[PDB]
Amino acid sequence: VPKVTFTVEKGSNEKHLAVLVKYEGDTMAEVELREHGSDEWVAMTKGEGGVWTFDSEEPLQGPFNFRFLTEKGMKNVFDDVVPEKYTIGATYAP
Numbered sequence: 001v002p003k004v005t006f007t008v009e010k011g012s013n014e015k016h017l018a019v020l021v022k023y024e025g026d027t028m029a030e031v032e033l034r035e036h037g038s039d040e041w042v043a044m045t046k047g048e049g050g051v052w053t054f055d056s057e058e059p060l061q062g063p064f065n066f067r068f069l070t071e072k073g074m075k076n077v078f079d080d081v082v083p084e085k086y087t088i089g090a091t092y093a094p
């Protein structure tokens with residue numbers, strides 16, 4: 001199995017993405033998300049169980065790029081891992 005997987009949780013909708021960011025061997029300290037084609041990185045709220053959501057006041061344009069800081073100081077970037085046509089429950093791994 002991969003080390004970093006991005007699972008789209010139940011409740012996601014066009015104006016509300018909810019992702020289960022897992023990194024075997026570490027924990028997320030903060031996860032930012034940049035929409036497709038924007039140069040802006042928005043912060044994501046730490047929901048619980050390790051789910052980071054984001055409530056956009058406009059719909060969200062995929063594919064999505066995620067960037068995180070782990071509790072161990074690991075800071076990686078992943079461009080486009082959750083496509084525009086993501087299916088819920090589905091796990092996306094680079």
